Amino acid sequence: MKIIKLYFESPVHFGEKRLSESKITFSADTLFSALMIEAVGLGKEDEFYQLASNNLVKFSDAFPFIDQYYYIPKPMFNLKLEKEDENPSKAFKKLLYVPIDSLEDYLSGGLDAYFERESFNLGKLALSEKVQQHDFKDSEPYNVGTFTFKENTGLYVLIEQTHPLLEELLENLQYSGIGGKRNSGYGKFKFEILEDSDIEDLFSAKGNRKILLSGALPKDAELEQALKNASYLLERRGGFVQSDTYATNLVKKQDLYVFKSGSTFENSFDGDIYQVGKKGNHPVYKYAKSFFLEVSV
RNA sequence: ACGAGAACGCAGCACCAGCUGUCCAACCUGAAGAAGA
């Protein structure tokens, strides 16, 4: 709809649980936390939170794009029911991201499992080796897991019905970085809003299968109906609260288990902005709203 | 309210020690300060 294309000119560190590892993408709660921190910095966190909770701004999580090829995580479809020939989900196991336009080819088979993998070539991971220099003690080494994007490669976020506030926070987020060691030399990108009409065709279409495009958690009143002919994967979201005015000490937020952003559902749900920090001075939010791409299955 | 915050891959270390740019080889060979009539 309004694809936020991210062009990174520095290696990124998106940690899953450890500083020594990096993942190639970042989630929607990570982007929401970054934008909320920017809004706190410029003093309208409440306006941004109301925009996000009232669905004025709702965004997927970051996906790879490689030379105007927008990719989507391989959806967890209840297919492979073709029980005669081929290799459904056999060679479709090392394939992590499928092109968003080639999704109909993947649905009915014919997508080349091998060719879709060497075609998918975005940068490469690295380990940065560092120390804390101590003038008289022994210097303690530590290392940071990083990912470097390629020349015509980056990440993109699906935003529908963009907002002036979202564009203003995205401009400020350029000069603060995104990811782990952004105050060191790791969070650095340029962004475009780049309205697209090919992608709008996919998201204006209806279907019997809803591909979840962001880490989402249905509310308790709808989790039961969401779990009906669903093919999902449950992911833990947590970590330490990143703020200056919370608890006067480093404290981990509550662990939130959400549906991973490749899950497919037949019943649509709209998640929630969950408060995973309640004992501190300010609320801590975990964006778990549902972004859906509908297909025919 | 970004599995995140803070953290120099940093400190000491001579590209250095020994070793003739040396050995062999005639500036040499031949030539009337001399003759008209």
Side-chain angles (χ1 to χ4, degrees):
Chain A
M1 284 73 74
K2 287 278 177 49
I3 308 168
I4 304 161
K5 270 200 142 179
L6 299 205
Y7 313 93
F8 292 93
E9 59 261 10
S10 80
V12 297
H13 169 57
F14 304 129
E16 319 95 332
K17 214 143 177 211
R18 314 186 143 69
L19 192 67
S20 61
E21 309 280 281
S22 186
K23 53 186 185 174
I24 77 179
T25 45
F26 62 88
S27 66
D29 46 304
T30 305
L31 175 62
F32 178 80
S33 293
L35 296 173
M36 181 62 71
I37 283 157
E38 281 321 309
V40 174
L42 59 86
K44 45 194 83 158
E45 63 260 35
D46 296 318
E47 198 201 327
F48 180 56
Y49 175 66
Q50 283 313 130
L51 285 189
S53 54
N54 297 341
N55 284 114
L56 274 296
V57 298
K58 55 172 283 203
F59 46 85
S60 85
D61 62 358
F63 302 130
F65 73 83
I66 306 187
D67 276 296
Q68 54 83 52
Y69 284 114
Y70 299 93
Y71 287 87
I72 285 295
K74 192 194 49 174
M76 293 182 286
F77 275 126
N78 278 126
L79 56 91
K80 97 184 77 178
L81 209 52
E82 296 83 6
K83 304 314 205 174
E84 305 113 314
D85 45 345
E86 280 147 337
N87 52 6
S89 293
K90 281 198 71 178
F92 295 135
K93 66 182 179 183
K94 301 253 166 81
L95 178 61
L96 308 173
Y97 298 96
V98 292
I100 192 165
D101 58 356
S102 287
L103 190 59
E104 294 294 328
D105 291 331
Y106 169 75
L107 274 169
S108 57
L111 205 72
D112 199 359
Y114 193 79
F115 172 68
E116 275 305 319
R117 295 180 47 239
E118 292 83 3
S119 277
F120 189 72
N121 176 21
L122 76 167
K124 66 163 305 175
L125 301 153
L127 192 69
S128 184
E129 293 179 354
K130 321 193 164 322
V131 285
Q132 177 165 357
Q133 190 267 353
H134 290 111
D135 189 358
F136 309 115
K137 292 187 297 180
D138 189 358
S139 292
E140 65 183 1
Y142 80 98
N143 63 7
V144 178
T146 54
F147 181 73
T148 318
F149 287 91
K150 272 177 160 95
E151 298 74 68
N152 296 115
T153 286
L155 297 179
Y156 72 97
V157 179
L158 276 298
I159 190 67
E160 52 159 353
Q161 189 204 347
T162 187
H163 205 273
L165 185 48
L166 187 81
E167 280 150 353
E168 166 205 341
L169 299 185
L170 271 165
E171 284 279 333
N172 280 262
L173 196 66
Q174 278 197 34
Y175 309 101
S176 45
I178 195 163
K181 303 289 264 184
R182 54 176 182 94
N183 281 297
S184 172
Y186 291 126
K188 207 195 171 160
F189 66 93
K190 301 287 167 199
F191 89 99
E192 310 198 8
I193 296 290
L194 188 153
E195 61 86 20
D196 199 309
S197 179
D198 184 355
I199 310 292
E200 275 181 1
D201 296 353
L202 311 155
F203 286 89
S204 294
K206 270 84 69 175
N208 54 282
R209 211 63 196 175
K210 284 92 182 168
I211 309 157
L212 182 64
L213 275 196
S214 66
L217 179 60
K219 297 189 284 293
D220 299 12
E222 64 183 4
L223 178 59
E224 204 74 51
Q225 63 84 30
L227 265 63
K228 263 172 196 167
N229 299 128
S231 176
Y232 61 86
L233 183 63
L234 200 67
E235 163 158 305
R236 181 214 71 111
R237 305 269 167 100
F240 286 84
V241 177
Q242 181 196 114
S243 44
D244 271 19
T245 80
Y246 191 102
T248 62
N249 225 332
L250 282 72
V251 54
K252 290 180 81 187
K253 59 177 74 74
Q254 294 169 12
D255 268 347
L256 196 70
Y257 293 83
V258 302
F259 290 137
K260 183 175 174 66
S261 79
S263 313
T264 77
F265 304 77
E266 79 170 1
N267 300 136
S268 178
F269 60 91
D270 194 29
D272 204 33
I273 320 292
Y274 294 95
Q275 180 167 335
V276 296
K278 302 165 177 287
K279 271 78 74 179
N281 295 319
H282 64 74
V284 179
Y285 296 124
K286 191 64 83 164
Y287 183 88
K289 295 285 207 70
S290 83
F291 210 90
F292 279 126
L293 162 66
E294 298 198 18
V295 289
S296 295
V297 165

